[model samples]
Each structure stands twice: as C-alpha cells, then as structure tokens.
Target: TKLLVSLKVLVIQLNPQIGQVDQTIKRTWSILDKVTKSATYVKPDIILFPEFALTGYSFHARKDILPYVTKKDEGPSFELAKSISEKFQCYTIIGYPEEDDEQKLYNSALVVNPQGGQIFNYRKTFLYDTEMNWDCEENPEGFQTFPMDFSKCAKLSNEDSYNRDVTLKASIGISMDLSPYKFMAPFNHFEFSSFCVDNNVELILCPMAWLNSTSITDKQTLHNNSLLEAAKNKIAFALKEQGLPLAGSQGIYQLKIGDSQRTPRVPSDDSTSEYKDMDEPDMSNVNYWILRFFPFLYFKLRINWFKNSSLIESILGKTRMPLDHEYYKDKHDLLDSEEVIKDTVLEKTFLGTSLGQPWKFQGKNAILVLANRCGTEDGTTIFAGSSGIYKFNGKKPSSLDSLNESVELLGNLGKGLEGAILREVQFEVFR
Candidate 1:
C-alpha cells in the first residue's frame, strides 16, 4: 500500500528594485522572518522566490549590473538565504544575477538545502531579447532536474524507516523557458513540454518576472490572459501527457490518470501469420478429385472458367460466380495493405519507429502550488500574484483558479504581493 504525504510550499512574489542590492536583500530578509515566524501559517518545506528576486531584471550593461551580481556562496543575499534555510530547516530557491570569478554574469537561481548547502544552481536557458544585450552567460546546461531532499519535514514521516529521506525530482526554468507558444525555427524547438517528459520531473519550479505586452490596447488583460493561458496549457500537457505537476507564480496544475483504457501490445513471432494467411492460396490446393488428377488441365479450365463465366452468364441470363483470387485479393489486400500503410504512416509522422512516442503521465495522484504576482512598479502593474493549493484524485486535470476543481485558494489573484503565501499539498506514491 502507498502512503499519502503532504508538502507545504511557499511562494514569495515580492518586487525587487532594480540595481538596489542592499535594499532588496533587506526587504527580502524582513519578509522571510515575518513569514517563518507566523504560528497561523503552515511551515513550508520549500520556499520559492521569483525571477531575479535579489537584483531586478532590466539592466543596460554588464558594468551597470556587475556590482550587484555576486557568487553563490560569497554574496550577502546568498548568506542570508543559507542562514534562513539552515535556521528554518526548509529548502529555499532564490534567483539572482550570478557572477563567476572570471567576471562572467548569469541570470541564475540557487537551490539551498536545509543543511545550508547549495544543492543546485541553474542558469536561464532561454533568454528574453533584452537579456541578450547584457553580459550574462549563455545557458551551458539546458533544462535540468535535481533531487531535493525533504526528510526534515515532520509531515513526510515514512512508517518503514526512521530516517525518512523523501527525495523528489525538481527542475527549474526561467521565464522564457516555459514559453512554447513563442516563435521558434522548427516545431520541434518547442522544448518545455518535452523537457518535463524527458526528465520524469515531478516538481517544476519556474521563477518568472513575466511582463505584459504594451502593443495591445487592453495590455493588462491581454497580458494576464496570455500568462494564464500558457500556464493552463503547460499544466494540462504535463498532467495529461507526463502525469506530473508544476508550480510557479502564474499557477499550479496537477494531473493524473486514474486508469488507462488500453495496455500496450506486445510483438509475437506469429504476428505476421494474419498477413501471410491473407495472401493468395497455393495453386496445388485448388479443386475436386477430378480437377486434382488433371491439375494442368484444371488450371487452364479454371482460367477459362473465370473469363467465360461472366460473359456466359450475361448471354445465358444466369448469375455469375466471381473468381476466388480476385475476390480474396481485394478483401485481403484492402485489409492488410491498409493496415500496414496506416501503421507505417502514423509511426513516421508522430511516433518514431525506433524511438517511440513521448513519455506520458501515469502517476496515481499529484499536487500543485500556483501563485500570481501582484502590485505595480514604475508605471507597470504586476498581476501574477494569485496563490492556491490544488489536489487531484487521479481523475482529471485541475486548473489554477477553478474553485470547483481547486482544493483551496491561499491567496487571491492580483493580491498578496511582497509576502509569503503558504499551502499544504498532499501527494500519494508507491514505495
């Protein structure tokens, strides 16, 4: 029997001032202290911070943002996060402008474990046009997954063992990495969906500073809808196809298959027997005792029979018998030939013959934590701060804001900015 484990995730959607390293760190520390201290709040096992949560995204040049960028272990912001993770005993994921000893910069996110160790450091794979102008390092490692240890959480206690190290696979992608609807050279370049399927990732952490498009007349609504739609598509695709759950400021989606209707067909040595049987019968097998004795004569007579039967019947006004070869040929050829062609064509088009189809979701249950950022900064209104806890009964896909489908709303849309929103999500798994 499998056990249901509950995980509490907290998303901090605070707005960080661009280039103000000291001020941003101070503000973040205060928010962390307040959220962690609250008795009414559920203690989160993992905390996620937004994209470039330490240093803002908009920067003109490397020199301008270089001062704000710091190494993972050496920076003031990194120290604060490490201290908090160690003190609170929770894994913390925070984004920053990372600088190497060689003076190279990157838009990176650091995952600090409860032991104050940096478990994973991910650089943004897909960059926005504005980011290209900066001196940030190109994504060397593409979308990658890391194992997160969650044994410290009291709620995740395993009955079989005292040292309950409930490890989960998590992958992180920056803003543009999640955008499959955007322009790409080939259709196969759309990788966000494929990445989740390839990695068998259970949890997806996306730190986004997703902005609104100013070209449209109703910029805010269009921007809001675009983000919401993308999140919905990603969540639905992951759940229905991959059977995994994803979390971000945009929303949380969990999908699982309760039961699959069909089992995969296995190939057998006699698989071609049906096709072989559909072929024309042996010439030696044709006939009655008289025809069998005079096979050559019967063969010529049979040929004549076919040709004359239709004409003779037309003249005598009698019904005609169709030739066996012609009758069976049409039936067998139509069935077998059509079947082979359909299978071949379909395999070449979508499913690869040797590689097989993409991975699909087959989990029994899943959980999702979604939040939207809210509040305006410098004439720009941020509306991604909707937060919620969602559950699935292995039945169907659940959206971020469907009250009927959602387990609970921890924070309303366009609300709860500059603070932490916490929710306890339950997940079931087999040993």
Candidate 2:
C-alpha cells in the first residue's frame, strides 16, 4: 500500500479588543489547546488568526490609543506566542501592531513556528483610510516566505526539539477595491502572483479586516476576481481569507456584542448559509504543493520588469477599463469618478517625509520624477531619463541586480545624481 500525505490548516475568526494583548493571547491559546487536544482527526499543521487580533483595528479619534495598540518586537506578546507555538508543535499566524526601532508603528502580521521561533513579519502595505489618527504608515517591503522546521515533531513541552521541514506562509491581506485601475489591477493580484511564483511559494495565509460598506457587491467582485487570477498564475494559491469572522462583527457575522451576557446574535441558518458557504477554499487539481517550476510564467515575469514602470503609468492614465479585464475592473467602473491616482511624491509629504521636496531636472532631456509611496511613506524616488526607460520583459530580481552591476562596470559619468530631500542618491544611465 502507498503512503498518504496530508497537510492540515485551521482558520480562526477572532474578535479582539483594542489594546488588549494579554487577553487576546490567552484567548488564542485557549483555541489552540481546544483544537489540538487530540491527534486523531483533529491535528492541524498550522493555525491562523484574523487581522488585528492582537491590537484590534485603529479606532477613530484614538490618537492617544496608539501606545496600547502597538507591541514591541520582542515584548511579552511575542514571548507568549513563542511559548504557545513551542507547546503546540505547530505554526501560527497572528496580527499585531509592529513598533519599529524609531518607535514608528506599522500595521503588521507575523508568522510563528511551534518551536518558539518567529518566522516572517509581513508589514501591511495597505493602510486603511481611517488609520490617519495614530500616524500608522504603510510598509515598503514586498511579500516574502520563510522555511520553518516542523518535521522534528516533539512533545508540546519539549524545549529543545524543533521541526526541520515546516514552513509558515504569511501576508498582510490587502483589500481588493479602492480606485485607479493602476493601483487596483496590477498590484492587486499580479504582484502577489508574480512574487509567489518567483519564490516557489505554495500556500498564502492572510489576516484581513475588510471595511464593510454599501459597496459590498463591488467588494466581493474585486476580491473573488483576484482570487481567481492568483489561482491561474500561481502554482498553488491558498487563502486563509477571514473578513471579521467574529460572530458579533459585520458582514460574515451577524452577532452583536454587549451588556446582556455577551452573546453573539447570529442570523438564521437560511440567512447565513450563503455567506458561510464561501468560507472554505477550493484548490486547483494541479498539485502546486509538490513544487514544480513553470518556465513560461518565469520568462513572462522577466519581460514585465523591463516594462513595469511604463505599464504602471499607462494604467494610471486610463483609470478605467473594460469590465472583462481581469480583476478590479468592475470595481473601477463603480468608482470611476473617484481620484485615487496618488502622485507618490505628493502623498509622501503628507506622511511628514521631505523626500519629494525641491524637485528639479538637471539634464537636457526631460526626465520623469516618480516618488514611490506605494508601500511606504519613506518614498523611493525614481528618476527616469531617456536612456533608462523600464521595459516589461521576463526577468528575475537577480537579473535586474546583475544589470545594475553591469552599469556600474562603466566609470561614473560626470553627471550628478537625482535630487532627493530626505535620502541621497546619484544618477547614471547606460546606452
């Protein structure tokens, strides 16, 4: 008889209070203990928590509340999570506020191994519109995956044992809607898919706290379309897609929290079944879990890098597209009148960074100055002269790195670098 291989994952919909770290940790521990009490028919390889389960959402007018919301990198919350992971001998994903060395707060989610190790920290690049009060900013870093050891398989209380082959997949789930086809389309699904395919990633665990509004139809459409797009592009795409899974919250949950016994007011089965039906994910029959390389997608991505800037610009100019275009097109139609195209440099100033100030062009030809505030307030300003226009061609990050290296091979030209107010840099071009 042949052996059977299986990977089990548990999704937990958490409703946590703002600034209540200790309580959240205790609750998470309780859930883990209850779920993993028995190995027969209930052992999960990993467990997931909903977005902001640690610090809770940034409530309005709560500027003073930030200190409570943010957690230190190596603080008690992390230590507690580490201990739980060690005890359970499984991986976990939890969302919390990340305080940087400078004490700046970033919306972040973390992946942890049961051996008491933190795997990856995915800072949220997409900040909600309501996050302005606490000075929370987007993260500039892109998505990444890390290898965790889960093969060692030791008892919960064993301190020294660790797994060697387990992996914790993590990401800050960026919502699908918002305006400007440029921001919504390419980055919505393409960027994620491209990153996953490049890194040989198989599973994606997301912690989401999506805003619920009358535009629910648009919301669902954009997200569903992107999920389909991701499945088509990436080898194996799995989403721990939680939208306020807590019973008392809006959308997926009808339960209300308060005075009379703290009960969650759930809707009737007939009313809730439809929403509940979409909870579980449907994986493609093509086994992406096995790790096979797709040469065609790889090459396509290379061509894309060369043209990335231009493609991004073109999309920005149009702002709308045929509904048939993949992902976010429908949502674009709904919000066509909205001006969501952010001039990266302009937005950076709003975050108190002076990077975009004193802009000028020293060259004979007009060069486009684009400040990339997409992922961070500390914007990366890109100065493009005629000689260095980006072209979309299939290539890897290393290829770009090598190309930059080759350019440096030539002696530095007499030309000075592009001007940046906050960060310093020099400019050079290749023929």
Candidate 3:
C-alpha cells in the first residue's frame, strides 16, 4: 500500500538585465553551489528559475529579442538547467525565449531531470500585453502533465518506497498564464486553476517575470529604508553612457544602457527617464502578484475594487478594526500607520496567491511551486519576489499567510541591480 508522497523544492527570484544574459547563468549556478554546499543544506527535489532568468524581460520588438532566443534545446538557459539539475541531482526548471525552426519565437520554459535530460517544455500561452510587442504567440499546447519518479534520482529505504508509487499530474505555466486570456474574457472562465482542478494536477511549477506596482509619493510600497538609499546612490552617477541599444517601452525607466555602465553618450530619452523617476517604480507594470489567484473569487474582488478604489478601502475597513499591532494596547502604542497597513497589504497579497491556486486542487492533493524574479528589470519594472511552495492536502492550509514559511522574498521590494544576482531558500513538501 502506498503510504506517502514527498517532494522538496527551491524557488529562485532574481533581476536579469536586458542586454546582459550570460552573467545571469553564472550567478544562478553560484546560488546552487552555496545552497547545496553543506550537510546542513537539504537537497531540493526540484528547483525553479523565473521567466527569462537569463535575458531581461524588457525589449521593444522581435528584432531586439531575436538575438537572445535559442533554437530548440540549444542555449545558455538549457545549459543552466542541465548543469544545475545534474550537479544538484534534482529536477530543474528554467524560463527563456525560444525560436522554433519554423522561425516562430515563443516565450518558453523547459524542465530537466537529475540525469540532465529534458523532461517537459511549455511555451507561454497567456501573453502579457508587453510580450505582444515582441510578437509572442499563445502556446498551441495549453496545459500538460508529466510523471516524475522520485525513486529514479534518490535512493530510498523500504519504508520510503511509497515515493515510487506517488503519481502526480503536473504542468507548467509562465507569468501571465495565471490570469484569464487578456483578463477580460469572462470572470467565470477559470483557465489555469480550472485546468488543475479538471485534470487533478498534483503539482504545477510556474516561472514568472511578474512585476510589482509602485508609486513615487506612496513610498510605503517600497520594501525598506534601502529604497531611499538606492535613490541616494543614483544621484552619485549623474551622467550615464550608452552601453547597448536596448529600446525601452512599457513605461519602465530604461536606465537605457546595456548594464547601467558608463560607455559613451548616445541620443536617447531613456537616459533621462531613469534618473527622473528613479524613486517611482514603473506604472505600466502590472503587479501580477495580485493577478494570480482563483479566478472566481478574485473576479468578484476585482469587480468590487474595480468599481471604485474607495470600495476596496471601505471593504477592508469593514473587515476589522485597526490596531497598533498583534497585541492591542493604549493609544500610546500608536506610532506608524504603515506598520498597521503593511499587515493588511501583505494579507491581501498573500491571500491572493495562497488561497487561489492550492484550493483548486479539488479531489487530489496538489503542490504549486512558483519561481518569480525580483528587483527592477529595465530599471523600474518590478517582478514580485514572493516565490514559494503551496500545497493542498484534504484541505487548504489556513495559515498559508505564514508568508516566510512558504513564499520567499529575495530582498527589500525595490532593490535595483546591475545585471543578475543570486538569493536562495529551501523548502520541503511532504504528503
């Protein structure tokens, strides 16, 4: 009789610059080396890298991105996937740009097993509006599931042979796929989550370039005191040289160069844009973090919030009374409103992802592991960094808001980086 099923996952969040691709791979490998360096480190059964982890997400047109796309399984992205999966002896998933022999370019993700062989490949089906600029196509294959045999990679005792019997329906989706087609087809139309419910997808791995929303005056959204410091640092480098011809769009502050280097001056408005609104995160960027959730529940929340921003405020107000903190106290306890609002802010953010996906597992237990990029890509478009492991057993984990336990944040919310960097945390899922 099969007694149990277990899996371990590691999710990576990063910021990969537009023109600098190879450096991202090296940074990614170093993270693997550090995490699995010692006995204290628990080996991940699966590892995830965000969408376009090697190449940055902001590009103007197909010609701009074509240089970065790879044909079939031949590219740095796959090499990174193969090398890491083999080195750590685990399943590795990575996202990148793919060019088919047909000359069609697709936003794709590939999965590699511990033996360094390709296992699953999925192209982005739900294209974000930004992706359309580079002429991305909807994936012909929408949702898919494949088998993973734990016994093949790891040696197990007799009692653990149940790992061999564990069968799971698994699939992969990219950043925007979490939402409905164009997000306007119909609220009742549950696409990705519904697919999991229909097929009984036991596990789903998603790699995302999803962004977080920000504002100039509303500094509260910025992660920490670091945002001001980062702003201060930007003032030191008043003059920037043109590094690469990265065309900037999507309301992102382009920093306009290849890697924010001092190359040579080029005639560009993007150069001025970065310094002008260095403090303001991109408005064009959709905080996909909030977009990802069970469609119906969120759709209702969406319509209400959409009706008026004040409606959202009113609903939140009705939900509960404001407090100083976890422990109620006299009025003297009052200090910062952000300290209070931050919890509600995270609650909805956490509430969106954790509640929506896992609960849709329906009759079967399922695991949803998502790897999302962090920091600013194209200078100001933020990828929501809360990557985590979500599972559903007989019931949803009510404490899913145990944010750090499941979703991992790479750094303070708005840390801008030069090209690429590594941050890691490990997690295990046992059922």
Candidate 4:
C-alpha cells in the first residue's frame, strides 16, 4: 500500500530594518497574517522565514546587537512565534541571534510547532567571515534532524480523512551552512554530505540573508557578478548529489557600512529580462517531490565506499579494485572508479533539476522547496526575488540522459520584490 501525505509550505523573504527589533517583528507578523488570511490554496504546514528575520544583519559591533539577542525559553520574538504557530496550527522556523545563559551568542534558528512547543534549536554550524566577529559561538553539535509526525493531527480533527500515521524527517541549516566551499570547518570534514546520509533526512529548511555584491553597474557586469548563480550552483550540486531536497529563502540586506540605501539585488535589464525568469520557480523559493526505492541504503553504500576506497586499495594492492576488479584492466579503468560510483549511486536514487538545469537528488519521498519574496527600497542593491513550486516523479533513470524527463515544473517564480507568495505541496509516500 502507498501512503499519501501533503506538506504545504510558505517561504518568506523579508527586508528587515537593521537594529530595529520591534519593527521587524511587527512587519514579519503582518506578512504572516496576510498569507494566512489571503492565500487561496491550502494553508501551509510549515512557514520558513529569512535569516535574521527579526534582527536584521547590518551592525558592526557585537555589543550593538547583543541587546536584541533572544533566548530559547524566553524572549518576545520567540513568544510571538509560539503564539503565531498556535494560532495558525502550523510549524514556524525563524532566524535570530541566540544568547546562552553563559552570555555566549550564536547565529541560530528556532523551530516552533503548532502546539506552541519548541521543537529544535539549531546554531549555525558553519560561519562566514562576516559572522566571525559578531561574538557568535560555534555550533557544538553538528547538523541535526528532527521528526515531524502528522498522524497525531488526525486525532484532533474529525474532518480529516487521509493517512494520519505519517512522519517526515526534517533537517535545519542556517545561512552559511549551504555555502560549503566558502567555509572551512564543515566542508573540510564533509559534514554536509555525511549529515544527509547518516540522518536519512528527507526535507531541508534553510533561512538566509544572502547578499550579491556581484557588479551591478550594468547588465553585462551584473551577470558577471551574480551571487545568486554562485549560491544556486554550489547549494544545488551539494544537496542533489546526495538526493536531498532543500527549501529556503535568500534576500538582499545592507552589507556595507554607511551605505543605507536599499535596492533590488538584480536590476532589470531589457536585454537580460528575458533570462530573468530562467527557472519558472526561482531557485530562492520552490517545492520538490521525489519518488524512488532504497535511497538511504544506496546513499550509505555510496558514501562508505568512497570513504574506505583508499584503505581498500592499499589492503588489496593498488592493482586491484575491490567491488569490480574484473572490470578494470588498466590505470584508466582504475581512474573510472569515481564515475562508476556516481553512476551506480545515481542509478539507485531518483534525481531532478531546479531553476534552469541545476540537478537535484529526488529520493522516494515528497518534498517541497519554497522561496521568500523581498527586496530593498532605495535601489542601492538588486535583490532577486523569484519563488515557485515543482514536483519530481521518482523514476530511476538508466542514465543522466533521462534525468530531465523525470522532473515536473509546477509553479511560477514571481518577479522582484513580489511579496508573500504561497506554495502547497502533496507528497505520496510509498513503503
């Protein structure tokens, strides 16, 4: 028997005022209220807000922002999130500055469920150069995954009729967590890949305040310096290789000191406007569903094989390949091991593409990717606010040639600064 489940999500890309905690929270609530009251489709099961949604990231001194830091148990921001989650009956994940009892600070995200319970508190495991000076503590625990069971909801509602005994594994990551190459600790340790494989995580939630300082002087220069492209390329490749689906939002914020003018991240160029909406559901916000068989086992074998291949080679002698020694006759055959493993792994897992040919791993599960719509006001920056929804049929392709044929594009990637778009995704799980 196949189990069908639906997960509706809303990704909020917000332009928050730097240093103005109260106003930022008010603006965030207004948007949330609007989405709940105005959305025509099914209400979202989860709401993902941008990084630092309450406390914008523009201050230079740690002391300057310390007063705004929130604790997990107490704080106006968390209290409001709890109230909203309870009122709307949806899970909410928002980014904020976290202060420990020891006065230690960290860039963190708090997950609140519909019952007004704190599900998980994830500290940013990977920090960028921009965050190093902010007194943010390094995440002691690495990547973490939490389980959300919808089966219990059926007991609470008499009108519900679908499968009530469904559970989904979710993983949380902060802004720089996606930027593996730019960081040192997690990437060098292969934490991201390992986390996905070990945890059997089916869904990813990320909150980001991503910036693109790529030259925006003109159309040509803008393309040359696209931070969005860089980010999409890096994140999509990393997650897809493991057959994981990610949902998150990216926004433009003031990064430079004293340049307070707000602007869109990507300015409109008549010549480039044709390519502006390259991926109908922009990379920033989108939804994905994947169906396949034996994804977890395949991923585990795939990663373990790579990790121990060197030791295996040494023990068996460089001349012999352990799994397929008969297939290799020369150095070229030995060198093809990497490709062989990739083909073998991908053959066993489902895959898909997002936003203009960026491939993703779509395992046997339903996944939704959502983006937030937000931009600056003064035109000093160009914020690319493209968001949408998609679905990947979980078909095992014989080769890379059939990957594109397996994906289904489902929604529109809205224009720049288009605020508050909602996406609802239905995932049918077969076990």
Best by TM-score: 4
Tens-digit lDDT track of model 4 for 287-358: 111121122212223333444442333222222111222123333343446544333232221112211111
RMSD of each: 23.6, 21.2, 16.1, 13.2
Please give the distance, in angstroms, between residue 373's alpha carbon in candidate 3 and its true position after superposition. 0.6
Q: Where is model 4 more than 4 Å wrong at Cα?
A: 151-161, 181-194, 213-363, 366-373, 376-384, 387-393, 398-415
Best by lDDT: 3
Candidates 1 and 2 compared: the better one by TM-score is 1
Give a tens-digit lDDT track for model 3, residues 297-406.
22223333343443334224321212321112322111335445443332231122222232223233456666666555434354544454454343322111212122
Clashes per candidate, residues 3 or more apart or on different chains: 11, 23, 0, 22
Predictions in order: lDDT: 0.49, 0.35, 0.53, 0.50
- Candidate order by decreasing lDDT: 3, 4, 1, 2
Considering summed lDDT, which 10 consecutive residues are worst modelled in model 4?
Answer: 254-263
- Pick out the ten consecutive residues of candidate 2 with the lowest summed lDDT: 372-381
Q: TM-score for each prediction?
A: 0.59, 0.45, 0.61, 0.62
List the candidate 1 regions with Cα displacement exceeding 4 Å: 1-3, 37-39, 152-163, 185-190, 213-359, 364-383, 387-394, 397-416
> Which regions of candidate 3 fall more than 4 Å away from where they truly are?
1-3, 152-165, 215-291, 295-363, 396-431
Residue-wise C-alpha lDDT for candidate 2, range 1-431, written one tens digit per residue = 11111234444544455555677667656655544443333445565554555555645554655565445447655665576567667676666666777867766667777676786777765455545567765554434455544453322222333332333232333332112223444422334332333333334445545331211223344359665444333211111122322222211221111112211212223322122222211111011100111211222232343334323332333322224433342244213756654554232211011123211111101111111000001011111100111111222222222122111111110001111111011222111
Scored by lDDT, model 4 comes in at 0.50
Pitting candidate 1 against candidate 3, the one with the higher lDDT is 3
